[PDB]
Design a protein around this ligand. Structure first.
Ligand SMILES: CC(=O)N[C@H]1[C@@H](O[C@H]2[C@@H](O)[C@@H](CO)O[C@@H](O)[C@@H]2O[C@@H]2O[C@@H](C)[C@@H](O)[C@@H](O)[C@@H]2O)O[C@H](CO)[C@H](O)[C@@H]1O
Ligand SMILES: CC(=O)N[C@H]1[C@@H](O[C@H]2[C@@H](O)[C@@H](CO)O[C@@H](O)[C@@H]2O[C@@H]2O[C@@H](C)[C@@H](O)[C@@H](O)[C@@H]2O)O[C@H](CO)[C@H](O)[C@@H]1O
Ligand SMILES: CC(=O)N[C@H]1[C@@H](O[C@H]2[C@@H](O)[C@@H](CO)O[C@@H](O)[C@@H]2O[C@@H]2O[C@@H](C)[C@@H](O)[C@@H](O)[C@@H]2O)O[C@H](CO)[C@H](O)[C@@H]1O
Ligand SMILES: CC(=O)N[C@H]1[C@@H](O[C@H]2[C@@H](O)[C@@H](CO)O[C@H](O)[C@@H]2O[C@@H]2O[C@@H](C)[C@@H](O)[C@@H](O)[C@@H]2O)O[C@H](CO)[C@H](O)[C@@H]1O
Ligand SMILES: CC(=O)N[C@H]1[C@@H](O[C@H]2[C@@H](O)[C@@H](CO)O[C@H](O)[C@@H]2O[C@@H]2O[C@@H](C)[C@@H](O)[C@@H](O)[C@@H]2O)O[C@H](CO)[C@H](O)[C@@H]1O
Ligand SMILES: C[C@@H]1O[C@@H](O)[C@@H](O)[C@H](O)[C@@H]1O
Ligand SMILES: [Cl-]
Length: 314
């Protein structure tokens, strides 16, 4: 290992945000602090100096952005309330208003977060699990944090993945979330502006490890068209990918890369098939320097490859 890698919590929550190939990755250190590593032509940071706040040890870590102008990082307090670390260009980092609402969630809750797509407005949707094991949506629409739609029961401790996109023929954003139910299946719920939340769950994987990590992205929105990718840790101790492609639906799935038992997972993307992409980056723990965070890359030029073997501070 390295003194650097040893600072990274084993099975840390992982999140990532980007503006094309300008990357930020969030993780928890062994003292409970949330740190940011960065890629701006090369990897940097992830040190004691790149602390953006503190969270309960073992906390989920979620993040969403509007390019790198506005970044929001979500975690649990020691009291099992949702909290938020915020960055705005020109202001830097501060404690977001989410914590002030004191939303109490199950101590084992995960978190997902999206900015709503296709608007300049800063509108956020956060997904977590309440003590009754239901998935609750929380909303910011410019005038305080409020509860949104309750999305029903899920396996206690389920991973939660989420993405927002805007079809170019729609007048408003869509949302898709993924989670695990008590029967251990992985499922999708869906929100469109005309149907609201679709009544029924769509199964994307028949049986997954209990509380397996779940991470999702979408890209290349067009007229009533989208591409989506969902990742989770399967029982073979690897990340698997599930593929939605326009015109084919949920038509394929397969292993991507080995991880440590119980690794968490983050995904970012940019670009589209129509324009010499997309690009995909996955972050996870695969045992490099024991506890370092590693990267997997997909692009058009070279397809599937391992990227940075050990992210800063390793
Ligand atoms: C090794 C090398 O010199 N090039 C290969 C590498 O590409 C990286 C470079 O092309 C670099 C040029 O300045 O641009 C990088 O963006 C790219 O790296 C990858 O993407 C960035 C955004 C981060 O995720 C990096 O950790 C990641 O490695 O890798 C590519 C594709 O995987 C090609 O092999 C290049 O030949
Ligand atoms: C690549 C690099 O060396 N970045 C360092 C630099 O980053 C900051 C500058 O780019 C600055 C220009 O006005 O804007 C800052 O907000 C930016 O901060 C970095 O990017 C944003 C989006 C956040 O992710 C920040 O946490 C991150 O630091 O200078 C800073 C210190 O000011 C850091 O050393 C970066 O390493
Ligand atoms: C300038 C200022 O006083 N900011 C404090 C205020 O933050 C809100 C304002 O910053 C407002 C005007 O620019 O923008 C809001 O977006 C912002 O709230 C933050 O961003 C939104 C998208 C949500 O993520 C919020 O939870 C988050 O705070 O009030 C906050 C508390 O809400 C802080 O005190 C800011 O310093
Ligand atoms: C897959 C398909 O073509 N039809 C399903 C699907 O409905 C589609 C359909 O309404 C089209 C209209 O062009 O818009 C979407 O593709 C929609 O699917 C919804 O969004 C996609 C991105 C996925 O997340 C999908 O799971 C979701 O349902 O779903 C409906 C459910 O009412 C029916 O199952 C159609 O037969
Ligand atoms: C839509 C479809 O049939 N997908 C196949 C396909 O996927 C490839 C393929 O569409 C080529 C076309 O030359 O473009 C990419 O390689 C695409 O890859 C898929 O999307 C990228 C973003 C990644 O998520 C990657 O993991 C994924 O496979 O061929 C592959 C095998 O090479 C599969 O058979 C898909 O189901
Ligand atoms: C985008 C939509 O915004 C509000 O209407 C919420 O009540 C819905 O759950 C959804 O998040
Ligand atoms: Cl110093």
């Amino acid at each position: 290992s390295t003194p650097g890698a040893q600072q990274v919590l084993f099975r840390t929550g992982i999140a990532a945000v980007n503006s094309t190939n300008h990357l930020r990755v969030y993780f928890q250190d062994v003292y409970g602090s949330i740190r940011e590593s960065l890629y701006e032509g090369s990897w940097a940071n992830g040190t004691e100096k790149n602390v953006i706040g503190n969270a309960k040890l073992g906390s989920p870590v979620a993040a969403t952005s509007k390019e790198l102008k506005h970044i929001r990082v979500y975690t649990l307090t020691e009291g099992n309330t949702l909290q938020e670390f915020a960055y705005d260009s020109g202001t830097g980092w501060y404690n977001g208003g989410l914590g002030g609402a004191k939303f109490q969630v199950a101590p084992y809750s995960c978190i997902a977060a999206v900015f709503l797509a296709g608007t300049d407005a800063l509108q956020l949707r956060i997904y977590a699990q309440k003590p009754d094991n239901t998935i609750q949506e929380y909303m910011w629409n410019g005038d305080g944090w409020k509860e949104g739609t309750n999305l029903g029961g899920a396996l206690p401790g389920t991973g939660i993945g989420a993405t927002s996109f805007r079809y170019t023929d729609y007048n408003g954003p869509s949302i898709r979330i993924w989670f695990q139910t008590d029967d251990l299946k992985l499922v999708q719920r869906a929100y469109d502006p005309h149907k609201g939340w679709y009544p029924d769950l769509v199964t994307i994987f028949d049986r997954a490890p209990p509380r397996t990590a779940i991470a999702a992205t979408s890209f290349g929105a067009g007229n009533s068209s989208i591409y989506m990718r969902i990742y989770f840790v399967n029982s073979d101790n690897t990340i698997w990918q599930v593929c939605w492609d326009h015109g084919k639906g949920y038509h394929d799935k397969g292993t991507i890369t080995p991880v440590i038992q119980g690794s968490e997972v983050a995904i970012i993307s940019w670009g589209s098939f129509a324009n010499n992409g997309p690009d995909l980056r996955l972050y996870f723990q695969n045992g490099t320097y024991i506890s370092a965070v590693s990267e997997w890359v997909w692009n058009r030029a070279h397809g599937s490859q391992l990227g940075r073997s050990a992210l800063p501070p390793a």
